[PDB]
Amino acid sequence: MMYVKLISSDGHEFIVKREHALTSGTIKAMLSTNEVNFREIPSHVLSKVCMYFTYKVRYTNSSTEIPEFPIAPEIALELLMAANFLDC
């Protein structure tokens, strides 16, 4: 269907558009019952990953003047680790 579920290590369930989640080659491989469990990605990180999907779809080619994607210093290392695993 139109949406997929991404579950964080702490059990938060993130429901996102399939097309948004398929932007990650890792998630695409993990999907192929429309649900993926991330045993190592906590909610304060996975919520940011979902916000990145929305940002990327909205600002890719183009409409001009792209804002900066914000990342709080406290989440930066774990988000880097997740972006590296997800190929984001």
Partner 1 sequence: MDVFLMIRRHKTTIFTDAKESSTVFELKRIVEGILKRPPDEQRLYKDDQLLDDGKTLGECGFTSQTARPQAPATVGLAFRADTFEALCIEPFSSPPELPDVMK
Partner 2 sequence: VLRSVNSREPSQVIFCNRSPRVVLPVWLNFDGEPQPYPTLPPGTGRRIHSYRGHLWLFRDAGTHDGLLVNQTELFVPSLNQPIFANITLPVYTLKERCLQVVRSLVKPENYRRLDIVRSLYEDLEDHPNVQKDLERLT
The footprint of partner 1 on residues 23-62 (CB under 8 A) is 42-44, 47, 50-55, 57-59
Picked from partner 2, partner 1, none, the partner binding residue 38 (CB below 5 to 8 A depending on kind) is none
* CB closer to partner 2, 32 vs 61: 61
**Is residue 80 a contact point for partner 1 (CB under 8 A)?**
no
Site membership for partner 1, residue 63 (CB under 8 A): no
Confirm if 1 and 9 have CB atoms less than 8 A apart. no
**How many CA atoms lie within 13 Å of 43's alpha carbon, on the beta-carbon side?**
6
Q: Does the N-terminal peptide bond of residue 62 adopt cis geometry, omega within 30 degrees of 0? A: yes
Distance CA 81, CA 29 (A): 18
Chain positions contacting partner 2, by CB under 8 A:
49, 52, 55-56, 59-62, 64-69, 71, 73, 76-77, 79-81, 83-84, 86-88
